[PDB]
Amino acid sequence: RFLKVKNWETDVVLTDTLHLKSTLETGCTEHICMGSIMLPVRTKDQLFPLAKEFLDQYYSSIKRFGSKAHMDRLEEVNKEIESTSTYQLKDTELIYGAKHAWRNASRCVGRIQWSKLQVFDARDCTTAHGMFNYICNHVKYATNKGNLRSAITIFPQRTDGKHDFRVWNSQLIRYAGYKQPDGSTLGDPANVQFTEICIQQGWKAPRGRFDVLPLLLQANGNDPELFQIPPELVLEVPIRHPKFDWFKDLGLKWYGLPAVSNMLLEIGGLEFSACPFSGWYMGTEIGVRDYCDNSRYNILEEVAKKMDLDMRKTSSLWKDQALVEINIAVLYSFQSDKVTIVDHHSATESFIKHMENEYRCRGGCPADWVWIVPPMSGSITPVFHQEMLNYRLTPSFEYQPDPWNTHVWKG
Amino acid sequence: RFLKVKNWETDVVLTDTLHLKSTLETGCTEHICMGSIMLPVRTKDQLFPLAKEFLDQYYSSIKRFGSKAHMDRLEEVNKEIESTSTYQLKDTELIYGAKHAWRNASRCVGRIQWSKLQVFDARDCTTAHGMFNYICNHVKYATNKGNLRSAITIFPQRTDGKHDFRVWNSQLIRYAGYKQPDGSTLGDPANVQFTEICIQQGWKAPRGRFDVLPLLLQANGNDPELFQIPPELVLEVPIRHPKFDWFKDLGLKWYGLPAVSNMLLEIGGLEFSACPFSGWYMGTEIGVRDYCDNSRYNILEEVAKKMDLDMRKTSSLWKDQALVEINIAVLYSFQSDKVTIVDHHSATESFIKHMENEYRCRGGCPADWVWIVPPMSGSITPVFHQEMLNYRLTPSFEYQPDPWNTHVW
Numbered sequence: 175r176f177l178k179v180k181n182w183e184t185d186v187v188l189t190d191t192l193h194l195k196s197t198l199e200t201g202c203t204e205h206i207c208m209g210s211i212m213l214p215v216r217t218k219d220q221l222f223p224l225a226k227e228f229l230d231q232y233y234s235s236i237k238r239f240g241s242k243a244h245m246d247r248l249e250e251v252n253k254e255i256e257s258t259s260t261y262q263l264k265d266t267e268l269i270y271g272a273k274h275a276w277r278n279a280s281r282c283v284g285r286i287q288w289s290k291l292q293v294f295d296a297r298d299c300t301t302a303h304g305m306f307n308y309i310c311n312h313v314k315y316a317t318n319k320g321n322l323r324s325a326i327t328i329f330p331q332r333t334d335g336k337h338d339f340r341v342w343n344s345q346l347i348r349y350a351g352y353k354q355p356d357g358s359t360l361g362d363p364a365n366v367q368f369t370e371i372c373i374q375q376g377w378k379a380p381r382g383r384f385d386v387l388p389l390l391l392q393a394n395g396n397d398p399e400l401f402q403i404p405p406e407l408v409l410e411v412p413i414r415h416p417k418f419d420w421f422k423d424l425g426l427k428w429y430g431l432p433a434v435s436n437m438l439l440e441i442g443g444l445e446f447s448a449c450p451f452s453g454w455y456m457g458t459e460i461g462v463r464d465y466c467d468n469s470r471y472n473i474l475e476e477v478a479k480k481m482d483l484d485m486r487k488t489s490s491l492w493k494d495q496a497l498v499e500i501n502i503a504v505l506y507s508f509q510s511d512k513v514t515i516v517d518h519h520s521a522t523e524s525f526i527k528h529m530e531n532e533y534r535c536r537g538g539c540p541a542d543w544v545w546i547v548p549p550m551s552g553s554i555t556p557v558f559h560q561e562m563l564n565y566r567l568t569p570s571f572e573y574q575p576d577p578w579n580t581h582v583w584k585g
Numbered sequence: 586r587f588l589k590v591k592n593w594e595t596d597v598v599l600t601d602t603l604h605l606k607s608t609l610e611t612g613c614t615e616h617i618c619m620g621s622i623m624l625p626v627r628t629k630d631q632l633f634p635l636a637k638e639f640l641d642q643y644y645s646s647i648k649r650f651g652s653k654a655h656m657d658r659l660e661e662v663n664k665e666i667e668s669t670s671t672y673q674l675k676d677t678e679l680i681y682g683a684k685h686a687w688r689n690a691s692r693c694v695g696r697i698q699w700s701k702l703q704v705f706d707a708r709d710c711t712t713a714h715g716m717f718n719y720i721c722n723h724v725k726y727a728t729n730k731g732n733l734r735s736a737i738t739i740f741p742q743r744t745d746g747k748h749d750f751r752v753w754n755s756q757l758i759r760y761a762g763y764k765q766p767d768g769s770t771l772g773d774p775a776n777v778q779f780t781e782i783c784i785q786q787g788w789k790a791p792r793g794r795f796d797v798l799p800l801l802l803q804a805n806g807n808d809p810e811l812f813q814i815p816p817e818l819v820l821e822v823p824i825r826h827p828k829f830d831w832f833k834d835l836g837l838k839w840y841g842l843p844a845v846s847n848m849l850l851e852i853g854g855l856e857f858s859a860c861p862f863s864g865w866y867m868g869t870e871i872g873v874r875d876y877c878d879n880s881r882y883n884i885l886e887e888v889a890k891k892m893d894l895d896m897r898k899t900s901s902l903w904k905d906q907a908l909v910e911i912n913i914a915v916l917y918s919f920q921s922d923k924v925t926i927v928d929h930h931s932a933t934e935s936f937i938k939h940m941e942n943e944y945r946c947r948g949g950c951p952a953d954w955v956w957i958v959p960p961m962s963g964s965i966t967p968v969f970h971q972e973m974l975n976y977r978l979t980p981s982f983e984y985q986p987d988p989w990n991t992h993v994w
C-alpha cells in the first residue's frame with residue numbers, strides 16, 4: 175500500500191511505503207485522533223522475533239542480508255536467548271541501533287544530523303560513581319568548548335527490571351526550582367519536585383535563580399546517589415540583546431548543552447533505561463518555552479515593561495513583540511559566544527530537505543507535526559504547510575515514568 | 586474507553602465521554618496518525634438510522650426524550666422516508682442542526698459563540714437569482730455596518746444529486762488572481778483557477794490586485810450563473826499601522842466578512858450542499874496566512890525592507906519581526922474602522938473557557954489542535970498547552986469537491 179502527503183505551499187506530493195514497517199500503536203483509532211496527547215520484563219517468546227526483525231534490518235543496511243554472517247548471528251542470538259533469556263548487542267549493532275532510534279524519532283526536527291552521532295558504550299558500567307564518570311566525559315566531549323557534537327551514552331540494559339540503570343534527572347543539565355512559602359517560585363518551576371528530591375538526598379542548595387542541579391544516578395537497581403557535575407564542564411551563556419542594552423540586567427543565562435536523560439532506548443527488543451543523549455539547541459526551545467511559558471521562567475511581562483509596550487490590551491500584540499526580541503537575544507548571545515545553536519527557520523528548512531531525502535531513499539519519514547512546528551511563527555516555517563505521517567518504527571526512544579514513582583527503596 | 590485530556594500549563598485534567606457518540610472515521614488507525622492531513626445519494630435504508638439518531642438528540646435537547654411528540658415525529662419521518670425517499674426538517678430542527686454543526690466543528694476556535702447564530706432558511710429558493718438575493722441579505726445582515734453577526738443561509742437539500750444547489754465560490758467575498766505575462770501573479774494566487782472560470786463564463790475582470798470576485802451560483806443542478814455583489818455591501822478595510830506611516834503605502838486592504846461558502850451541512854442524514862456561513866475574523870487569518878503565506882500575498886520581504894531589518898541571515902529573526910508588525914496593523918485597522926475582529930490571544934482564551942463549559946455540560950469538545958493553535962506565537966496562547974481529542978460528531982460541516990470537477994455543462 176501507498177500513502178501520500180502533500181505540501182500545501184509547493185504542491186509537492188510524496189509517497190510513503192515505510193509506514194508498512196510500523197509495529198507499535200499510535201494511540202489513535204478510526205474513531206479518535208490522539209495526535210495532541212503528550213503520552214498516548216520481556217519473555218523469550220516476545221524477544222526472539224524482535225531480535226530477528228532488528229538483525230534483519232541491520233544486515234540489510236550493511237548489504238549482508240542472508241549471508242552466512244547474518245545466519246550465524248541469528249543462530250548465535252537465538253541460542254543466547256534460549257540459554258540466558260536475553261542477549262548482548264555487538265558494538266556495531268549498538269551504534270546502528272542508537273543512530274536509528276534517532277532517525278525514527280518522529281518528534282525530532284534535528285534529524286538531518288542522525289548519521290553523525292558519537293556513541294559511548296557504557297555497558298561495562300557497574301556503579302553510580304561509574305555512571306558519573308561516563309556522564310562527565312559525555313558532557314566534555316559533546317560540549318567541545320562551544321562547538322557542540324551530538325552524542326549518546328548507553329548504560330547496561332534492563333534484565334529483570336529489578337536492576338535498572340536510571341538517570342533520575344530529566345536532562346543532564348537543568349536549573350533548580352524552589353517553591354517559596356508565599357507560593358512564588360525561585361529558579362525553574364518545572365524542576366521543583368526534582369530539586370526537593372535532591373535536597374532530601376542531601377544536596378546543599380544555593381537557592382538562586384540558575385543553580386545547576388546535581389546528577390542523581392541509579393546503578394543496578396540500587397538507591398540513587400548524588401554527584402555535582404564539575405562546574406568547569408558546564409558551559410553557560412549570559413543572555414544579552416544586540417540593540418537593547420538593558421536586556422543583560424534581566425540577569426538571564428542558559429546552559430549550552432541540551433541533554434535528554436530520562437528516555438528509554440529500545441534496540442532489538444532490549445531496553446536501555448539509561449541512555450542520555452545530547453545535540454545542540456534550536457533557539458525557540460530556550461527563548462519561547464523555557465523563558466516564556468507561564469509555568470517556566472515566565473519573563474514576557476518584565477520584558478514588555480522594559481520595552482514600554484502598550485500592555486493594557488492583548489491586541490497591541492505586546493506579548494508577540496516581546497517574544498520575538500527575547501528570541502533574537504538568545505540567538506545573538508549563543509552566536510556571539512560561539513556556542514552552536516540553530517534558529518527555527520534554518521532548522522525547519524533543513525528538516526524539510528531531510529524529510530524529502532528520506533522519502534526518496536527510505537520510503538518515508540515519520541514526523542509528528544504537533545512537535546515539529548516551532549512554538550512561534552509557525553506558518554512562516556515550511557513545516558507548517560507540510561503534511562506528515564506519524565507512526566512508530568524501532569529502534570526507538572520512548573518515554574518512561576519518573577523513577578521516584580516506581581523505585582523500590584533499599585535504604 | 587473513557588479518555589482524559591490534560592492541560593500542561595495548568596494541570597487541569599478533563600474526562601471525555603462525548604467521543605463514544607462519534608460516528609464518522611478520522612483517517613487515523615492504530616498504526617498511523619493522519620492528524621496533519623488536510624483532507625483525510627443515501628437510500629431509504631441508510632437515511633432512517635441517521636434521521637432517528639438526529640431526532641433523538643433533538644428531543645433530548647428540549648427535554649422531551651421518549652415523549653409522545655418524540656415518538657409521533659419519528660413515526661412521521663419514517664412514513665415520509667418510505668414514501669418519498671427523503672424527509673423535510675421542521676424549522677426548529679433546522680436551527681438546532683445548524684447550531685450543532687458549528688458546535689461540532691472541531692477545527693473552529695470561535696465556538697464559544699455557537700448558540701448565537703442567525704439561521705436564514707432559504708429552502709424555498711428555486712433559482713440562481715433567488716440565491717443571489719438571499720446571499721446579499723445574508724451579507725448585509727452579517728456585516729451590520731461593521732458590528733458583525735454570525736449567520737448561515739441554507740438552500741434546498743440534495744435530492745437525487747443531479748439537482749444540487751452549490752455556491753461555486755470558496756467564500757462569498759474573495760479577491761481575484763491572474764497569472765501575468767510577467768510570470769508573477771497579480772492579486773490572490775489562491776483564486777487563479779476560479780477567476781479563470783469566471784472570465785470563461787463571461788466576467789469582465791478589472792485586472793487589479795484586490796478585485797472582489799463575482800458569485801457563481803448553481804440552483805437545482807443547473808449550470809451556474811454569475812452575479813456580482815453590490816459593491817456597497819462589501820465592507821473593506823484599508824490596512825495601516827499605528828506607528829509606521831509608510832505602511833499605508835503598501836496599498837493593502839482586506840474585506841471584513843469571512844464567509845465560507847463551499848462546505849456541506851449534514852443534518853439527520855440530509856445534505857445541504859449550499860449553506861454559506863459567516864462570523865468574524867481572528868486577526869492572524871489575514872495578517873499571517875493571507876498576507877504572509879509564500880503562496881498568498883507574500884508580503885514579508887517588502888515589509889522587512891521598509892523596516893530596514895537585517896535580511897542577510899535568518900537568525901536576525903527579520904521574518905518574525907515583520908510578521909508581528911503586519912499583524913499589529915491588521916488588528917489596528919479593523920479596530921479603528923469599528924469592524925469586529927478578535928486577536929489570537931483573546932480568541933484562544935475564550936476557546937479554553939468554551940472547552941471547559943463543553944466538558945462540564947456535554948462530556949467533551951472535539952478539537953483539532955493542528956487547526957486550533959494560531960499560525961504565530963503558538964505556545965504563548967493557552968490552546969498550545971491543551972491536549973485535545975479530535976473526533977467527528979453529526980450534525981457536521983464537511984468539505985466537498987469543487988463543483989467544476991463534478992459538473993456536467
Ligand code: HEM
Binds near residue numbers: 282284287437451454
Ligand atoms: C543535533 C541537534 C538537534 C536538534 C537541533 C534537535 C531538535 C529537537 C527539538 C527542537 C525537539 C523538541 C524538543 C522539545 O520540545 O522538548 C527534539 C526532540 C527530540 N529529539 Fe532532537 N534534536 C537534535 C538532536 C537529537 C539527538 C542527538 C537525539 C538522540 C540521539 C534526538 C532525539 C530526540 C527525541 C527522542 C525527541 C523527542 C523528545 C521527547 O519526547 O521529549 N535529537 N529535537
Ligand code: HEM
Binds near residue numbers: 867
Ligand atoms: C464568530 C466568529 C468566528 C470565529 C472567530 C471563528 C474562527 C475560526 C478560525 C480561525 C478557523 C480556522 C479557519 C482557517 O484557518 O481557515 C475556523 C474554522 C472553521 N469554523 Fe469558525 N469561527 C467563527 C464562526 C464560525 C461560524 C459562524 C461557523 C459555522 C456556522 C464556523 C464553522 C467553522 C468551520 C466548519 C471551520 C473549519 C473550516 C474549514 O475546514 O475550512 N465558524 N473558525
Ligand SMILES: Cc1cc(N)nc(C[C@@H]2CNC[C@@H]2OCCNCC(F)(F)c2ccccc2Cl)c1
Binds near residue numbers: 452
Ligand atoms: C510529558 C513529556 C513527554 C515526552 N515524551 N517528553 C517530555 C519532555 C518535554 C518536551 N518539551 C519540553 C520537555 O523537554 C525538554 C527537552 N528538550 C531538549 C531536547 F533534548 F529535546 C533537544 C533539543 C534540541 C536539541 C537537542 C536536544 Cl537532545 C515530556
Ligand SMILES: Cc1cc(N)nc(C[C@@H]2CNC[C@@H]2OCCNCC(F)(F)c2ccccc2Cl)c1
Binds near residue numbers: 844867
Ligand atoms: C483543502 C481545504 C480543506 C478544508 N477543510 N478547508 C480549506 C479552506 C482553507 C483552510 N484555511 C484557509 C482556507 O479557508 C479560509 C476560510 N476562513 C474563514 C473562516 F470561515 F474560516 C472564518 C474565519 C474567522 C472567523 C469566521 C470564519 Cl467563518 C481547504
Ligand SMILES: C[C@H](O)[C@H](O)[C@H]1CNc2nc(N)[nH]c(=O)c2N1
Binds near residue numbers: 212593970
Ligand atoms: C498538548 C500538546 O501536545 C503539548 O503542549 C505539546 C505541543 N507541541 C510541542 N512541541 C514540542 N516541540 N515540545 C513540546 O513540549 C510540545 N508540547
Ligand SMILES: C[C@H](O)[C@H](O)[C@H]1CNc2nc(N)[nH]c(=O)c2N1
Binds near residue numbers: 558562621622623
Ligand atoms: C498540513 C497542515 O495540516 C496544514 O498546513 C494546516 C496546519 N494548520 C492549519 N490551521 C488552520 N487554522 N488553517 C489551516 O489552513 C491550516 N493548515
Ligand SMILES: [Zn+2]
Binds near residue numbers: 207
Ligand atoms: Zn491521529
